[PDB]
Amino acid sequence: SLRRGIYHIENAGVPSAIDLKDGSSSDGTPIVGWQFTPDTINWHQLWLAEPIPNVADTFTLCNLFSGTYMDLYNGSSEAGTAVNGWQGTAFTTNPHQLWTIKKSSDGTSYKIQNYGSKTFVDLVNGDSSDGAKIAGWTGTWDEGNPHQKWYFNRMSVSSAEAQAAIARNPHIHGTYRGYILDGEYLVLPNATFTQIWKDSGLPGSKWREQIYDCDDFAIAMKAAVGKWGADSWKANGFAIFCGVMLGVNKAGDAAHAYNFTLTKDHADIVFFEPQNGGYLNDIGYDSYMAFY
């Protein structure tokens, strides 16, 4: 089954993503096809999939920005029925907001079926225009129709995935202990991670013995990303990925505190120096503790 997490949902036929129009929280805001920029946060185009207990392959889909849910208007099975953002909750019993999401016949893209109507999410006429209508539409699980096929591009990691990325890194100390703080994390492109740093007041901060040294920079960066996450998104049930690490050098005579993020492919960690905004594959320290 599709895993719990945050997805950028991209049509299989044309490069249009599922977009809540203007990110609006109003009930009935149309959900439309819209172009996107890879390796950015696409602000109106991120969807938190929450599995429904006891209902196989079925999910609510919550817009990360608005906190409102993908909703089939009045649950109508009529072809052309509006698909809109609407107030709801993560584990609602409202079938208008419940979606069975399973692999299409190509085995890579998914089809998205309303649980009540049994109709499918359809980019009408495969229109690649910004603001193209998305509707519930008659269809089948096995047909090739690209109007109803959707790539679920995973934008989050589970804590287990983050832990695996750390574990395969070559700069981990033998004494390493990791402390996990949340369960599912939006992975930032470096462009956004950098922006948060740039706006944090840290670029302007002076290194000062004990009173504002390694530990203070690293903790301040983590706090900055935490604040950004809450200020930026209205959905709940996920965190923003930003780790803190304490490390020791090879000679075992010097220590450092710093941050880390994740690669685009989610497979590896990358170290971040909060004193200068630099990204490094080797920061010159082996991590003996991390929290994230």
Ligand X SMILES: C[C@@H]1O[C@@H](O[C@@H]2[C@@H](O[C@H]3O[C@H](CO)[C@H](O)[C@H](O)[C@H]3O)[C@@H](O)[C@@H](CO)O[C@@H]2O)[C@@H](O)[C@H](O)[C@@H]1O
Ligand Y SMILES: C[C@@H]1O[C@@H](O[C@@H]2[C@@H](O[C@H]3O[C@H](CO)[C@H](O)[C@H](O)[C@H]3O)[C@@H](O)[C@@H](CO)O[C@H]2O)[C@@H](O)[C@H](O)[C@@H]1O
Annotated binding residues: 8, 10, 96, 147, 171, 181-182, 210, 213-216, 256, 282, 286
User: Strand order in 172-179's β-sheet?
Assistant: 172-179, 286-291, 243-248, 255-262, 269-273, 278-280
Q: Is residue 35 involved in binding ligand X (CB under 6 A)?
A: no
Exactly one of 11, 68, 84, 148 binds ligand X (CB under 6 A); that residue is: 148
15 binds, among ligand Y, its own copies, Ca ion, none (CB under 5 to 8 A by kind): Ca ion
Residues that bind its own copies (CB under 8 A): 177, 179, 181-184, 205, 208-213, 215-216, 219-220, 222-224, 226-227, 229-230, 233, 235-240, 246, 257, 289, 291
- Would you call 108 exposed, middle or buried from its count of C-beta atoms within 10 A (0-12, 13-18, 19+)? exposed
Q: Which residues contact 73 (CB under 8 A, 6 or more apart)?
A: 28, 81, 82, 83, 84, 96, 136
In angstroms, how far is CA 209 from the centroid of its own chain? Answer: 37
What b-and-e string marks burial along 199-226, b requiring 16 or more CB atoms within 10 Å of the CB?
ebebeeeeeeeeeeebebbbebbbebbe
Taking CB under 5 A as the binding criterion, the range among 14-22, 99-107, 157-165, 248-256 that sits at the site for Ca ion is 14-22
**Chain residues 198-217 in contact with Ca ion, contact rule CB under 5 A:** 201, 210, 213, 215-216
Residues that bind ligand Y (CB under 6 A): 19, 21-23, 27, 34-37, 40, 42-45, 71, 73-74, 86-88, 92, 94, 96-97, 130
In angstroms, how far is CA 73 from the centroid of its own chain? Answer: 26
289 binds, among ligand Y, its own copies, ligand X, none (CB under 5 to 8 A by kind): its own copies
User: What is the contact surface with Ca ion in residues (CB under 5 A)?
Assistant: 15, 181-182, 201, 210, 213, 215-216, 239
